Every structure is written in C-alpha cells, then in structure tokens.
Ligand binder design. Structure first.
Ligand SMILES: CC(=O)N[C@@H]1[C@@H](O)[C@H](O[C@@H]2O[C@H](CO)[C@@H](O)[C@H](O)[C@@H]2O)[C@@H](CO)O[C@H]1O
Ligand SMILES: CC(=O)N[C@@H]1[C@@H](O)[C@H](O[C@@H]2O[C@H](CO)[C@@H](O)[C@H](O)[C@@H]2O)[C@@H](CO)O[C@H]1O
Lengths: 424, 423
C-alpha cells in the first residue's frame, strides 16, 4: 500500500486560521480532500501560538490542533502533525523568547531544548487521544534556521544536531504513531550543513524528503525535461543511500508544481510524471502533495507562485492538477513495490557515512548530472555510498551489477537554496 | 481632576491571555481594579496577533480588544489602548512579515507604514464604538526598536521619525478620545536618538513619560534617597520643558517600584513619595502605575523583578503597594494643581528646540545633578530652554525670577538603558 495525501493549507485564513478558525470551513476543506481519495493530511500549527512563553503552553492552541485532527478523522483521513513552525512559505514564526533581547539557539540552548521536549510531549500526549493521529514531525524544514543563507541563523555543529535529534525524537515516540523530522534539500546539497544525510536516513522512523524543482532543476535542465520530472525520484534514491538499513522507508512528504519555474498548463503532466517516476523507488512509502488549497490572494509578501500551489483554488474548486493527483491515488495506492535496481551511482563518504562532497549532489553537480544521464538512458540507476560499493558481499546481495563513480567531481551549477530571487 | 489608573496585566496568562481569553477572569481583574479606586486602565494587545500578515487583520483579535474595553467601561473604567506591541517587559512581539527573510523597517518602509496606518484606522473605528475608549497610544515605548542598544534595530533619522509620527497620529485621531504615543527615557538621555524631546512635547495630544528608577537613578543617588523619589517629578518637568505649549498636559503613563533596585518592604513608601513629589508638577494629568497584577511565577525568562511589579499578587489579593496607591488616589484625585515655580534650570537647545547635550540630562548628568541639588535644597526648580531664558518678557510672564545654567556640562554617569544587566 502506497500512501497519498496533502499538506493542508486552510482555505480561509491560511495558517493565520489558528488565530480565528472557521471550523465549518475547515470541515469543508477536509471533506473535499477526502472526497478526492486522499488518505492523509499533514497539519501545521504555529509554534509561538502553542508556546508563547518558554514555560507556558497555550492549552487552547493544543486543543485546536486536536480538533483539526479529529475533523480529519471524521472524513477518513489520517493526520500527521508538524510541531516547530518555525518556517512556512518563506515566513519565520518564532517565539519572542528566542528573538531580539532574548536571542537564543533552539538547537544548543539547554533550556530551549527542554521546552521543546515539553511541547512535543504535551502534543503527543494530547493528540494520541485521537485515532486519526498517525505521526508527529518535529517541524517543517527545521534545518533552515541552522545555517546560511538564513539571515539570523542558529548555528550548530552536526554533533550538536545529533544531540538535538536524540533529545526530541524519543519524546515524540509512542504506539500508534510515527516520530519524524523534515529538512529542506540543503541537507544533501550544502557542504558543512549541520543537518546531515546520515541523520535523515537513520533518526526518526522514516527518511523524509521535500522535492522542489525551483532549486535549479527546472531552471538548468528545463522545466519540461525528463530530468526535471525525475527529480523527486533522484531525491528518494539519494536520501535512502545514506542509511544503515537499505529497507528504511522514504516519505516524499512535500512535492509541488511551482509556477515560478513551471508553466501553469503543464502542472498536471508534471504532477503525473513526477509521481510515477518517484514510485520507481521501492522504498517509497507515500507522497504528500504541496498543497491542498491556494493561499488567499488577499495576503501579501508571499513569493507569487505560492498562491497557486493548491489542488483546489480559493473558492474550493478542484483544479486540473487536483484531478490528476486524485487519479494517481486511485490508480496506484494499491500498486506493488518497484523492482530492485542493478545499476548504481557511487558517492564517496567519510567514516561517518556522509558525502565528503555535498555540492556535487545538487542540481547541475557532477553526481546529479551522472544520475540523470543514466536515468534518461533507461539504466534505472540507484545510489550507494563508497562504503557499500567496497563490500562485494553487499553488492551481490543487493543484486547490483554495474557501478558508476563520479570520476571528476564538480559543484552544483544550477543550485539555489532559496525559493525567490528576492531572498538572494 | 487628577487621574489614577494602572497598566492592566491580566492575572491569568499575562498578555498571552489574548490567545485564549478567560473573560470571567478578565471581568474580575477589572472589577478589583475599579474597586481599588482607579479611574482608568491601559490595555496591551499583541501586534502579530492583530496583523499576522501585512494585508490581513485578525478581526477576531480586534473584537477581543473591543470586548476588553467594553468590560472596563462596565466597571466604570476609562480604557486607553496601545497598538504596536512590539515591546513588553523585555520581550519583542514582531509580525513575521517584518523579520528574518522579510526583515524590514517599521519606521521607514512605505508599505509597513501603510499597513500600520490600516491597523490604527481599523482599531480606532472599532474602539470608537465603545464609550469607555478614551485614547489610542501608537505603542508601548516604540522608540526602543529605532536605535542602539536594540540587537536588531530598525534605524531611522529624526526626520524619518517625524514623518512616521505625522503619518500615523492623524489616523488615530477622532472625537471622543486622545491620540498619543510613548517612548522610553532614551528620548531625553541618549544623544543622536531619533525620537526627540521636541517630538514628545509637540506630537500627539499629551506629553507621555515612563518613569523607571532602574535606569541608574536608584543605583547612583541611592534607592531610598530623596533624589530617587523625586525622579518622576524631574522627568515630568524635563519633558514639558521642550514643548512650545507651556500648558500641554504631562501623563505619567508608567511608574513602578522595581525590586531589582529597591528592597521589597520599601516599595509602598517609594510609591507614596514618588507620587506626592510628581504631583508638584502643574501640568501632570494623571499617574498610571505599572502594573495591576504580578506576572505569574510559572512564566520564565522575565527579569526576576517583573514578577512582583503588581498592585495585586498572583492570588489576586491586594498588596501593600496597592493599598498605598488606592489611598493616594482617594486623597489626591480632587486636589488642585500645584503652585507655579520661580526657579528654573536652563537647558541649551538647538534651533529645532532640542537639547544640544542629551547625555547631560540623564541620571548623574550635569543637568540632572543640578536640578536634584536645587530640588533637595527646597527650591522647587522647574526647567526651561535657553530660548525661553533669552526673553526677559517671557520670563516675567511665567513668573521666573532666578535662573540656573549648566556651566560645566558632563555626561550621565549613572545611566543604563536596559532594565537588566543580562541584556
Ligand atoms: C525563504 C525560503 O526560500 N524558503 C523556502 C521554503 O519556503 C521552501 O519550503 C517548502 O516550499 C513551499 C513552496 O515554496 C513552502 O510554501 C513551504 O514552506 C514548504 O515547506 C523550501 C523548499 O524546499 O525552500 C526554502 O528555501
Ligand atoms: C530590553 C529592556 O531592558 N527593555 C526595557 C523595557 O522593558 C522597559 O519598559 C517598561 O518597563 C517595565 C518594567 O521593566 C516593563 O514591564 C514594560 O515593558 C514597561 O513598558 C523600559 C523602561 O524604561 O526599559 C527598557 O530598557
């Protein structure tokens, strides 16, 4: 069974709805989503509304998240909840006790981590009362705060991020639901980034990826190229390469058709092709489209393409990409896992198991260029580390017959870490 | 008539009460405040809850502010509402469309100002439906974002601040209420600060001051000293010295008894002496104590003394300082204005009317020391600018017979601009 769902953006009020929720409108949103054949939603509370003080949790805010989970369960949806937003569509929502006069570091400050731990525990304890609650994500792209290009970064070493993850994820655990975190693609593509590919493929219950072709994939390879619609597949094969466990599932927790780089008329086809190719990774556990509903036009300072990432429009009308994604779910939720792959691109790793050269992995880098060349020639390449490639027994076990290495590496020609040129 | 009131800190949840208002608790808070003898409260909504997107105002949040004003009026309290928080008790509440990836300047960015104007208009129009709405203050100490030592300042020139005020204050105007703004004391004590004394004494309806002796007054002169308990008076005479209307009211909009520089058991006497000396200013319109209720102990990262600034404790019982303030209100709300003064300290100003040397006005500065010395000696000194001092006719009309100039100026020796050394 392959899971299909959406990242739920409330159609009246966006995530400002938490400040004045239109519950009848939220019910209409979730009914529509369910009637499209989705089996789950991802839900995003706002951190400074849940925890306005380091030692004071907004109990009503928690109850509002529980209510939203409950409504989704009414309509047969499983609910996954991200806690630390944090970052949403280019906006940072940070509690006042971590900014300006109270500038702190949410990854390395002992009492910040303790308060985070307490909120996760409060959230897990309360949401576990809803059968529809199926997993908790530490937060949406929590890594973006930890490094440049972020203009007020909370820097950390990878060892500190190891300790941060090890301090929060066990608190999210419990029977009946998963414990996860998410990162943006800087984890695989930015050198010296403290969130690492090994962490993503070892900590938490599944390997989580967000697939966004405005990072240079559409720009350099071509919006309609096969490379661009194979990019979610490349990310899935890339992320799972760095785990101890070759069977660890991969969750494509975010994937959208951004119209700052794709043509509007092309997005249905882009969606179909991207999903189908992503499903050629046999570790793939599910696909969660970004996003459910257009961001209200009355709201400003969004990069313009964010307003039309929806499967429904602002009036609640189903868009053509929406119809396509619902057709993908009905056809493929019952499909069999993909055949294994016998051709692998090899990535050199250090002793810890992380790429020594991360810049070569991004859009227009030597490793990406190599995988794309092989993919578009029908060689169906998977990805492995140099540690696995050196193990002749593992290779024969995994069935791999042909290895391709990055013979002369180069940095990512196309890569940009931001979604809009005005953030560069 | 002299006004007595409090800055309203909700006893359950503090200003985080806005996220989940316990309306029976707020009604009871305001009832206890009314029964102590206060005639007004000052209310603090949170800006990122009212306007979480530049072009999207939370109408529920607006309505919640209206309801609080309405409850205040049902207990016979006048309500004064401050909009841009902004800053509360060492915490900044900034909307996400002004920070990090969207970092902008709330003073000089055209569309931030237009959005600020839209929120002021929205607030004014809703709150004007409530008879208890007597005043809109742009925000609590809005100058603190404009300059050092703020760690992410939105810098601005004094001309740009002139334009900011002139763009916002007409929008808050309306029949039945005042339009004002508020600043911390860096306006008078920090050279080069873009909020100026002439602005405070000319823009908006009243000269607004916040009097906090942890700025070096208590440390320098001594917590129990007469100079320390004469500080609110000094500040009121100082702030009104820079307005071209000699009759413009002065609102002592915040004054508290901070236990980081005062001993707990002294705070009632500090309260009595501070208030009694401050009423020796002829222009003083009212005193508004900080604050009604202790900050709940379960909330952390406050400077420790913030917790006990209340007139009521966390159980909602009247504190000894609260008893004193209720007794000051009952004794002095009918009192007649103070006698005029004949001894003046003269401050040299530029052609715009602003102090040449602001640093000498601060605690332990040469002008502060001069005025304290005369005040301690019994000479009831007022303060005028060199422009008034150069006109022998104006002096006689004001009945000033003796002038003291600052002949050897020096910078403020005691002044600190933050409430806590941990900043
Ligand atoms: C500041 C910036 O450029 N941030 C972007 C993120 O917004 C983006 O996050 C994902 O992408 C969608 C569509 O833009 C966005 O609405 C959500 O926040 C989502 O989580 C991310 C893409 O990997 O890239 C960052 O650079
Ligand atoms: C960062 C900092 O030190 N800020 C303080 C302000 O908090 C303070 O404002 C007033 O002080 C009381 C008690 O500290 C506080 O609860 C309110 O914010 C109030 O408005 C100001 C006093 O002049 O000093 C600043 O430095």
């Amino acid at each position: 069974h392959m899971k299909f769902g959406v990242n739920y953006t409330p159609s009246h009020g966006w995530f400002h709805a938490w400040l004045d929720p239109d519950w009848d409108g939220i019910d209409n949103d979730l009914k529509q989503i369910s009637e499209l054949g989705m089996d789950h939603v991802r839900i995003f509370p706002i951190w400074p509304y849940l925890q306005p003080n380091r030692t004071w949790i907004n109990k009503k805010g928690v109850a509002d998240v529980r209510r939203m989970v409950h409504i989704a369960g009414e309509h047969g949806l499983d609910a996954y909840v991200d806690v630390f937003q944090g970052h949403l569509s280019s906006f940072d929502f940070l509690p006042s006790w971590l900014v300006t006069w109270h500038a702190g570091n949410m990854f390395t400050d002992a009492d910040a981590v303790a308060a985070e731990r307490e909120l996760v525990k409060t959230m897990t304890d309360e949401l576990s009362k809803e059968p529809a609650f199926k997993g908790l994500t530490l937060g949406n792209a929590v890594n973006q705060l930890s490094d440049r290009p972020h203009p007020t970064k909370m820097s950390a070493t990878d060892r500190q991020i190891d300790a941060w993850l090890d301090a929060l994820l066990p608190t999210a655990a419990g029977e009946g639901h998963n414990a996860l975190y998410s990162v943006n693609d800087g984890t695989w593509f930015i050198d010296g980034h403290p969130f690492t590919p090994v962490q993503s493929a070892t900590k938490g219950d599944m390997t989580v990826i967000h697939s966004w072709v405005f990072n240079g994939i559409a720009q350099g390879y071509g919006a309609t190229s096969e490379e661009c619609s194979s990019y979610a597949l490349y990310l899935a094969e890339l992320a799972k390469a760095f785990g101890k466990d070759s069977e660890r599932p991969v969750w494509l927790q975010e994937v959208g058709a951004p119209e700052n780089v794709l043509e509007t008329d092309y997005t249905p086809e882009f969606c179909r092709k991207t999903v189908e190719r992503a499903m050629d990774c046999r570790n793939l556990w599910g696909v969660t489209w970004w996003c459910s509903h257009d961001v209200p036009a009355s709201m400003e300072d969004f990069p313009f393409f964010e307003h039309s990432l929806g499967l429904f429009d602002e009036q609640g009308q189903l868009k053509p990409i929406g119809r396509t994604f619902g057709e993908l779910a009905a056809q493929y939720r019952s499909a069999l896992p993909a055949q294994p792959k016998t051709v692998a691109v090899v990535i050199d790793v250090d002793e810890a198991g992380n790429p020594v050269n991360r810049s070569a992995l991004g859009p227009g880098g030597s490793v990406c260029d190599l995988w794309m060349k092989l993919q578009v020639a029908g060689q169906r390449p998977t990805i492995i580390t140099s540690q696995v490639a050196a193990n002749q027994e593992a290779l024969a076990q995994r069935g791999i017959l042909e290895l391709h290495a990055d013979e002369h590496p180069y940095a990512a020609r196309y890569y940009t870490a931001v979604s809009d040129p005005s953030f560069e």
